[PDB]
């Protein structure tokens, strides 16, 4: 279908309405083929560089064959330059002549992940994979998934369109090799749309009422949200690290496209909240995240202390990256809510709600000198309320005598946290110019 | 015969403007995880995703848990159930 529709696009003068009707049917039933990143890459350039290069370099390329490439590839680690040479001549071929090589490349993508291969092989294989994607995506996606399963069912197209997260159940070595992560994200973005279409068709088929429709919608929303969630989990570093910068950038681009495609995903991923170690990354990586300043006011209203703690932390980085009147009109509300929760919260939760959100206040001060006296008032108030609570029950460090200056008690930890934050805000104000 | 329900605490503070109120939990939540998506907290997301997908490709709540004494109404269950067996 993809090949024929491209041919029809090319030839428009003859086919009067056939082109229009075909394109409507495609875009309405097969949305996992109308992904702009696929068709844009087709237009390439008008630079004729590829044409001129091919016309003068194909000649008689010593009759390269799928079996020839397979022979070299079975011993690629012993000889990598042979593989380099073969694929280098592969790149020149036209979008059609490449099909015979679909199995050879896709089937044997496992050992590419092995350490040592110069990333030129991977880049060239990615380019070839994109060329093949522009021609035959349906078969290619299934081939790639079943080739990248970890080291073993043979997933089918209909199987993947049901549970597309199957795409992410791949070799963990994939999450640290940029060129193949790109391909995995392409498949994921395709198959999420494909799943939408599949469910939409399935419900209409099985109708032989609304409850079902909004069940479909809820399922799709949760499905997109979960995909985003695992993607962010990928961005998180693994303990071994304690490449990743390229992987995070590619995930950032994909997330940006999803967010522009639909807002509700932005509103849902956040109401679920995600590990707050990632905020410093995403806030800058995804340029279309400023929208959060719309609903953070709604978010803070949620009863869950976890949700409120997340909201304030997010607002901290948003205020740094963007400094707008709306941002300040919400930053003020943040401090007011913190003051309110100070009054309304027992100590056991006061610790759990104030320790991981106080370092957020230095960010507000950095962003808004005007919103400063309120910050300092709240800081001193919380400081001395905690100090008063300290004396109520005997302590072993007794931070009171520290006035003239491990696993400790919660209140001592809270007081030390407030002291550190005040040191930090003083430093940022001194060096903030 | 009218019950009184505690309201969401409304705390406007003079230290999204002047009409804000941090919500207070209401016991009678009964969230519809299946009908709506903003429920399903992060931890159980995979479970509820798979369960919703199964439930669809094959109702609104997975657990009924009637707290009423109805658990001991074997009489009403019998009246629902037909039983024409007579000697």
């Amino acid at each position: 279908i993809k090949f024929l529709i491209r041919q029809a696009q090319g030839l428009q003068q003859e086919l009067g309405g056939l082109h229009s009707a075909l394109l409507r049917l495609l875009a309405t039933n097969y949305p996992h083929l109308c992904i702009v990143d696929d068709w844009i890459c087709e237009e390439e350039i008008t630079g004729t560089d590829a044409l001129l290069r091919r016309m003068l370099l194909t000649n008689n390329a010593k009759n390269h064959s799928p079996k020839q490439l397979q022979e070299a590839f079975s011993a690629v680690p012993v000889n990598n330059t042979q593989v380099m040479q073969i694929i280098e001549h592969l790149t020149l071929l036209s979008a059609s002549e490449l099909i015979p090589y679909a199995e050879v490349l896709t089937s044997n993508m496992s050992q590419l992940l092995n350490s040592g291969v110069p990333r030129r092989i991977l880049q060239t294989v990615n380019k070839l994979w994109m060329v093949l994607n522009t021609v035959m995506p349906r078969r290619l996606w299934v081939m790639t998934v079943n080739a990248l399963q970890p080291s073993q069912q043979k997933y089918t197209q209909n199987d993947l369109m049901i549970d597309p997260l199957i795409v992410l159940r791949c070799d963990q070595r994939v999450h640290r090799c940029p060129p193949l992560m790109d391909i995995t994200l392409h498949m994921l973005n395709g198959y999420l749309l494909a799943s939408k279409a599949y469910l939409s068709a399935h419900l209409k088929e099985t109708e032989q009422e609304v409850t079902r429709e909004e069940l479909k919608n809820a399922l799709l929303a949760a499905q997109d949200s979960a995909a985003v969630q695992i993607l962010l989990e990928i961005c998180l570093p693994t303990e071994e690290e304690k490449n990743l910068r390229e992987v995070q950038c590619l995930i950032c681009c994909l997330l940006h496209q999803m967010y522009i495609a639909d807002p509700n995903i932005a509103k849902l991923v956040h109401f679920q909240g995600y590990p707050c170690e990632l905020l410093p990354l995403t806030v800058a990586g995804i340029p279309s995240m400023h929208i959060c300043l719309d609903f953070i006011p709604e978010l803070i209203a949620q009863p869950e202390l976890e949700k409120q703690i997340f909201a304030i932390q997010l607002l901290s980085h948003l205020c740094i990256q963007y400094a707008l009147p709306k941002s300040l009109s919400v930053a003020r509300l943040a401090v007011n809510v913190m003051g309110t929760l100070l009054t309304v919260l027992t100590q056991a939760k006061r610790y759990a709600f104030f320790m991981p959100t106080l370092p957020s206040l230095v960010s507000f001060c950095r962003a808004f000198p005007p919103l400063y006296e309120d910050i300092m008032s709240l800081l001193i108030q919380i400081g001395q309320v905690c100090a008063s609570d300290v004396a109520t029950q005997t302590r072993d460090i007794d931070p009171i005598i520290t006035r003239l200056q491990g696993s400790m008690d919660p209140d001592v930890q809270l007081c030390h946290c407030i002291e550190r934050t005040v040191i930090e805000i003083i430093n940022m104000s001194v060096s903030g110019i | 015969g009218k019950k009184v329900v505690q309201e969401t605490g409304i705390k406007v503070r003079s230290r999204e403007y002047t009409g804000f109120q941090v919500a207070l939990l209401n016991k009678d939540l009964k969230p519809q995880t299946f009908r709506n998506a903003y429920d399903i907290p992060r931890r159980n997301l995979l479970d509820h995703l798979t369960r919703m997908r199964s439930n669809l490709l094959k109702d609104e709540d997975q657990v009924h848990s009637v707290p009423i004494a109805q658990m001991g109404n074997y009489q009403e269950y019998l009246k629902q159930v037909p039983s024409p067996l007579r000697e």
Partner: peptide
């Protein structure tokens, strides 16, 4: 507002979206 047009940009002159309790 305008998720793709950016907050600092020249302006051109010429079904449950909320939490169940909220």
């Amino acid at each position: 507002t305008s998720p793709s047009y950016s907050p600092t940009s020249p302006s051109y002159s010429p079904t449950s979206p909320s939490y169940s309790p909220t």
